[PDB]
Amino acid sequence: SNAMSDTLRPYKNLFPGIGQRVMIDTSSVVIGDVRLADDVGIWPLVVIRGDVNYVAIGARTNIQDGSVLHVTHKSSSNPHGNPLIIGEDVTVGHKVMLHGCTIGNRVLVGMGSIVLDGAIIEDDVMIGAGSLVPQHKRLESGYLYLGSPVKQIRPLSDAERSGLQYSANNYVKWKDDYLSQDNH
Ligand SMILES: [Zn+2]
């Protein structure tokens, strides 16, 4: 709002719920019903707005710089609305737009991509930079998708599959580097 300048902010009676060893950059804006599990890192200049619906982010997931995360409101034609559900060990790349979608575990969303409402990204998926995942699109586990709108390109190589976990692991280490700077 116009006077509220906190990093963590209310919407009506909703307020973020934060686990352990969570980094939320001071320059970022986290509003309302945003549930951040252990070891989540929210990098600079990110907005996560869980006002008209909730946002749930699983453990050891990074939301990289410049991303915006939002949701669709609840109404008669859509009583549930579209909340934003993100699993564990997920890498949300820089400048990603996530809106009302579901992302499983060990997914890398390439920088500059857009994922729209009702999309469902299964576990162990990579999305190339600059992609667009349309509303209600399901992305099958174990594949590379890229394009606007995305096409299924090929199965992930075994190295790429492992790389999904490596990315999440690296980002937990890196957020811990920043947190260690705070504690000193
Ligand atoms: Zn929106």
Task: Please give the backbone phi and psi of residue 177, each rounded to the nearest 5 degrees, phi first.
Answer: -60, -50
Residues with Cβ < 8 Å from 150, sequence gap 6 or more?
127, 128, 131, 132, 133, 134, 137, 139
Centroid of ligand 1 to alpha carbon of 51 (angstroms): 10
Which has the closest alpha carbon to 153: 141, 166, 162, 144? 144
- 59 in Cβ contact with 37 (< 8 Å): yes
Centroid of ligand 1 to alpha carbon of 34 (angstroms): 15
Right CATH number for 1-184 from 3.30.310.50, 3.30.1490.20, 3.40.50.620, 2.160.10.10?
Answer: 2.160.10.10
Is 73 flagged in the annotation as binding? no
Which has the closest alpha carbon to 32: 14, 17, 47? 14
Tokens encoding 111: 């920088």
List Cα–Cα distances, 68 to 48, 84, 105, 113, 166, in angstroms.
Answer: 6, 11, 19, 11, 24
Is 184 flagged in the annotation as binding? no
- What does the domain layout of the chain look like in residue ranges? 1-184
- 133 in Cβ contact with 145 (< 8 Å): yes
Centroid of ligand 1 to alpha carbon of 71 (angstroms): 5
Question: Cα separation of 181 and 91, whole Å?
Answer: 23
Centroid of ligand 1 to alpha carbon of 181 (angstroms): 34
Centroid of ligand 1 to alpha carbon of 83 (angstroms): 10
Centroid of ligand 1 to alpha carbon of 166 (angstroms): 31
Experimental method: X-ray
Which has the closest alpha carbon to 112: 132, 129, 91? 129
Question: Cα separation of 16 and 32, whole Å?
Answer: 6
Q: What type of residue sits at position 163? A: G
